[PDB]
Design a binder for this molecule. Structure first.
Ligand SMILES: Cc1cccc(Br)c1C(=O)C[C@H](O)C(=O)O
Ligand SMILES: [Mg+2]
Length: 711
């Protein structure tokens, strides 16, 4: 691996050539001033970054020893212990965030937020274009409309099914933009007359119960090619084309209901991608640059232009055609050898992402074929532990801004609430970023990993399925909204909640995920453009602004309930229960790692023991592996149990990769597979991974595979 010398740094060539030739051109930043800033910032801030990591390590070891002693569970001493060692810190005086220059998609619009692996250009394209989405297509192609008799998806179009689809959308129209009398089911056509939309019923004509909800149209107003509506800030478009295949059989000629869906999208460098050397990081960076320049393209799929409409009065306007883009950097933990120093030390990957994803984002503020119409750069910062780690991110962005020539506080931060030391100090974390913070979000799967590892010593934890209802997570989700609303997040920043992982269960999603807007959350996470279109339905039924107003001032979680450790009860499980939980964890562990290590895929649909398809990434692996590591620390299972289960499920994994050519199997030669040995190591060494993180082992084993594939 050939490097380029810049001060104390030895930048890998592929990254040096990439920043120079692709990312710096067009930003009026001088390559020598850039790299000099990289060198200076890295030398300046690498100390404190490593101090913070040792603090984690040190705090975790006192808690470790504290549990080991202890013979009960007195919560007042635990409280007093964590406060004394500086885990639990004072709550600052109330305040209100000052974050200026933020986009309407973030301060004001409530609606779905999509997260996508930035290293998959085809997915990253679809996510950017997921601002608008076909409701017919999402209802038809998923199980929202059951596949009962007559209505099952065929190879051709099912009209029984298609009619149910139409009926479903008509009830949504009724439940969202109601008529003065009558139903959209009984409509026969639409007109705008005197700046007012008029729906033709069979016997009469009616207009909107709230004509305000009429937003515009396209085509000649006498028979518009489409009618644009709004509700709760989110846009509905009825497409009217009577000679389209679906439109011919429709009573008002309707061709589709288009829903404003993915309002924002997070392009992800962290848990949903595998990127272990400068080659990998450049693939992601280059995709990130193509999104920001407007020219990322796969074929030939390209990014969509804005959308022109006609106002009800008669003028013209236009609407954002793409999803407003965050980028999720990696956090404070890992280093990458894309850059090493003279001693050969690897450079902190978090710092590298702030420089490089920041630099690249300048294109997003510029006329090439535009992202933040108000001037801001949106960085999701994951896996932070406490307020001092928030301030360090602040300082890092400050130093990257002036190396980049950007006014201060240009790089805004979306705060992940996914580490226990952040949870129990959330308000101080928000205060630490008061003039940058652009959202908070409950990363509940990472938060469950940290929950398990922090109390790894206290005793055996409840099964994975039981965590969803444990007291600590119920108080964690409420405590997050309270601190958000108390810091003035309404009309200023997003209050966001977590990922729906059951990519095939859209019936359950449409039925369940409504609890998040009902919870006061102005955004929540979806795994596909289709799930975004469906999740948008929830924001039309729930008035999130109204919900937030009714939560103002409420304090709904005690510090004592946040610290309620999900321990299991004496003799709480039977042999087949334990056997099932083990098998299930090993299968989710194995089926994710094998594609991580063997192919560099950081997010994969992996069916669990019940054959429920779950989109996995590092956080759910953080949970499966730390749970098994905890049952091992306390005797629930043995190392032969784990070895057995691993060899039990592994051939089933190899089989499931029946869909996927050029793939290496794990079974029978378990000790000859780097993926199997990594799966094993994540479990058997899980207790000793800092805060239960999976990157160290995953990264080291992925490079191992790459190096063995060099021969
Ligand atoms: C856990 C997960 C599954 C599928 C896609 C994504 Br995206 C994620 C997250 O990384 C979410 C998150 O950061 C968390 O900690 O739950
Ligand atoms: Mg996470």
């Amino acid at each position: 691996t050939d490097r380029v010398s810049v001060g104390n740094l030895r930048i890998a060539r592929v990254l040096y050539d990439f920043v120079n030739n692709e990312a710096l051109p067009g930003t009026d930043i001088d390559p020598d001033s850039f790299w000099a800033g990289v060198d200076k910032v890295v030398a300046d801030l690498t100390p404190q970054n490593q101090a913070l990591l040792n603090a984690r390590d040190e705090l975790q070891a006192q808690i470790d020893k504290w549990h080991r002693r202890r013979v009960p569970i007195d919560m007042d001493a635990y409280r007093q212990f964590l406060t004394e060692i500086g885990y639990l810190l004072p709550e600052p005086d109330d305040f209100t965030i000052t974050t200026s220059g933020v986009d309407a998609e973030i301060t004001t619009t409530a609606g779905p937020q999509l997260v996508v692996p930035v290293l998959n250009a085809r997915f990253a394209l679809n996510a950017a274009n997921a601002r608008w989405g076909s409701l017919y297509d999402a209802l038809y192609g998923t199980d929202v409309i059951p596949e009962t008799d007559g209505a099952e998806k065929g190879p051709t179009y099912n009209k029984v099914r298609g009619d149910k689809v139409i009926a479903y959308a008509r009830k949504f129209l009724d439940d969202s933009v109601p008529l003065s009398s009558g139903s959209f089911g009984d409509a026969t056509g639409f007109t705008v007359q005197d700046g007012q939309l008029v729906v033709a019923l069979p016997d009469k004509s009616t207009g909107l119960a709230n004509p305000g909800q009429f937003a515009g149209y396209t085509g000649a107003a006498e028979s518009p090619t489409s009618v644009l509506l709004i509700n709760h800030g989110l846009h509905i478009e009825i497409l009217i084309d009577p000679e389209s295949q679906v439109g011919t059989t429709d009573r008002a000629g309707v061709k589709d209901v288009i829903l404003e869906s993915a309002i924002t999208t997070i392009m992800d460098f962290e848990d949903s991608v595998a990127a272990v050397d400068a080659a990998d990081k450049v693939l992601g960076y280059r995709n990130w640059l193509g999104l920001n320049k407007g020219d990322l393209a796969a074929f030939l799929r390209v990014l969509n232009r804005d959308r022109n409409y006609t106002a009800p009065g008669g003028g013209q306007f236009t609407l954002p055609g793409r999803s407003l883009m965050f980028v999720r950097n990696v956090g404070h933990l890992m280093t990458n050898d894309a850059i090493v120093d003279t001693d050969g030390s690897e450079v902190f990957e978090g710092i590298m992402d702030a420089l490089f994803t920041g630099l690249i984002a300048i294109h997003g503020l510029k006329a090439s074929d535009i992202n933040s119409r108000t001037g801001s750069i949106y960085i999701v910062k994951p896996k932070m532990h406490g307020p001092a780690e928030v301030a360090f991110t602040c300082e890092l962005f400050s130093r990257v801004e002036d190396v980049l020539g950007l006014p201060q506080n240009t790089m805004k931060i979306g705060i992940m609430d996914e580490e226990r030391r952040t949870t129990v100090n959330l308000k101080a974390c928000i205060k630490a970023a008061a003039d940058r913070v652009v959202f908070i979000n409950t990363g509940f799967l990472d938060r469950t990993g940290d929950e398990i590892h922090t109390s790894m010593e206290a005793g055996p934890m409840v099964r994975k399925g039981t965590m969803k209802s444990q007291p600590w997570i119920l108080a964690y989700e409420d405590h997050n909204v309270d601190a958000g609303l108390a810091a003035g997040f309404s009309g200023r920043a997003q209050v966001g909640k977590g990922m729906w992982t059951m990519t095939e269960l859209m019936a359950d999603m449409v039925e369940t995920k409504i609890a998040q807007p009902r919870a006061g959350a102005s955004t929540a996470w979806v795994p596909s453009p289709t799930a975004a279109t469906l999740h948008a339905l929830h924001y039309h039924q729930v008035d999130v602004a109204a919900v937030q107003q009714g939560l103002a001032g409420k304090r709904r979680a005690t510090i004592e309930q946040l610290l309620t450790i999900p321990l299991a009860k004496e003799l709480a499980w039977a042999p087949d229960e334990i056997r099932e939980e083990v098998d299930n964890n090993c299968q989710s562990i194995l089926g994710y790692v094998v594609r991580w290590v063997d192919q560099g895929v950081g997010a994969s649909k992996v069916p669990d023991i019940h054959d429920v398809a779950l989109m996995e990434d590092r956080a759910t692996l953080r949970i499966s592996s730390q749970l098994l590591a905890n049952w091992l620390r306390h005797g629930v299972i043995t190392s032969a149990d784990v070895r057995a289960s691993l060899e039990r499920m592994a051939p089933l994994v190899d089989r499931q990769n029946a869909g996927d050519v050029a793939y290496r199997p794990m079974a029978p030669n378990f000790d000859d597979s780097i993926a199997f040995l990594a799966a094993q190591e994540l479990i058997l060494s899980g207790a000793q991974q800092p805060n239960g993180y999976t990157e160290p082992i995953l990264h080291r084993r992925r490079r191992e595979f790459k190096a063995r594939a060099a021969e």
